Amino acid sequence: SDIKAVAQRALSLMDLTSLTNTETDQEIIDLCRQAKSPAGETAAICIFPRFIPVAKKALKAQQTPHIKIATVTNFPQGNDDLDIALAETRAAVAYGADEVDLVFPYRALIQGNETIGFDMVKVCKQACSGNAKLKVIIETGELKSEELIRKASEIAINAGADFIKTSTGKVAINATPEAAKVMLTVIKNKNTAVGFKPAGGVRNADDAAIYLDLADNILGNEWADANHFRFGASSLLISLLDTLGH
Amino acid sequence: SDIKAVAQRALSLMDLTSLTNTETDQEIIDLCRQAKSPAGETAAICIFPRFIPVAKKALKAQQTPHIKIATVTNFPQGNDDLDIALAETRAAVAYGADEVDLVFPYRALIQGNETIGFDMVKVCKQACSGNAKLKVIIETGELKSEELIRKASEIAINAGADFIKTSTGKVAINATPEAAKVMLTVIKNKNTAVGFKPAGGVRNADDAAIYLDLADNILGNEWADANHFRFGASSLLISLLDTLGH
């Protein structure tokens, strides 16, 4: 089968994630070590903001500057308080984050407020400029309908998202093929320089193949590189390594 | 009662502190609610940086905007990594901190390195410039000798500290009368605009009265206001309230 090539590609696109909120410094350092895997480096790691300085030091020491540090803000609830989301994003940037995964206020959109979503992504993009990329989590599992998923994707991109992301991993339904298709379609129609990040429930190479196949069909075989595509996952890495015989 | 006069004074100078590192948002909100006591507002609360936005919302919600939000960095170990301490301080400010309690690299000082402590305080002070006050924790319990306690105090003040603070609360010996006398004397001799914060072990009004008397005797009855004196404590508030009859 084609499963090993898929596994290799997926691994290089991973945001290797630990978000238990009870990590120790040692566990953060181990995560940095694991990101440098026998089958190549992941695109990035993803951790809570306070761990960024320890991670930055660990990544420098093992000489992996191409492994970026992602973090999360307004996470995971996606509340509609702009001052809080902005302060957290500024802090993340001040910590040294390379990327900030911001949770879009999806409940406010559901209730019919499209403005708060736009304003929040916009100010957080401004705060990131010259320091970090902005990924926006729209929580497709809660948005449910194709209409809202499309809408949220369009608003996020209009407001300045560098990536659009499916899920926080913290609700019942996270990444799904149908949600992925809608978001990739919005990217193709609006801005192919905006990246896509399926996250939550991506267990193995088979799952990974689902989303890579969609990106390939919709935007072309060459589109999904580390600057256009990420897998938000944790235990996926162990699975991929096993598929690759490590 | 003379001691009720003390309980009232000490209460108004408190940094009501919770640093378990497992706080919930509700526990942070509860802490703010406690800062608004039946005997008046404390000077500040002190919490880990990630809780600052929620606390700020909670204090505004209860219409107590003048209760300061302090936080901690390089805490509690006081390592000698400037880049880490700087990043954490920048983040604390970006979160919205009114005050940052930085732990001085006291082990480095004990080892004969004076420059790293000076440099750390200076860049962290510059990081606070125009947004926050900087408290410097010198850890008198570990410095032990009067010479070292005096030295750390002088370094902190010369490098730009707004307060010098006795202890983290995390070592064997925290706030002591003897360490307070040394630190207040340096303040009197060098820069009377620099505040003093005894922390850890101040259980009640009698304990409070000890440090307030030292400040009064050394610098004058008028010197010790919320801009020059703080109590770093937790359980002390319940005791003071019990003294004032609440």
Residue numbers in the entry:
A (entry chain A), B (entry chain B): 2 to 247
Q: Which lines from the publication concern this structure?
A:
The enzyme catalyzes the formation of C-C bonds between an aldehyde as an electrophile and acetaldehyde as a nucleophile in a highly stereoselective manner. The structures display a canonical TIM barrel fold built up of eight β-α repeats in a toroidal arrangement, with an additional N-terminal helix (α0) directly adjacent to the C-terminal helix α8 (vide infra). Furthermore, all DERAs investigated in this study form constitutive dimers.
Comparing the substrate binding pockets of the new structures with DERAEC, no amino acid exchanges or significant conformational differences were found within a radius of 5 Å about the natural substrate (as represented by the covalent intermediate included in PDBID 1JCL12). DERAs from psychrophilic species had a similar thermostability and were around 20 K less stable than DERAEC. The relative B-factor distribution of the backbone atoms reveals a tendency towards increased flexibility in helices 0, 6, and 7 of the psychrophilic DERAs, compared to DERAEC. Hence, our X-ray structures provide independent clues in favor of the hypothesis that adaption to low temperatures in psychrophilic DERAs involves a more flexible environment of the substrate binding pocket. Nevertheless, by installing a disulfide bridge in the interface of DERACP as a psychrophilic representative, the melting temperature could be increased.
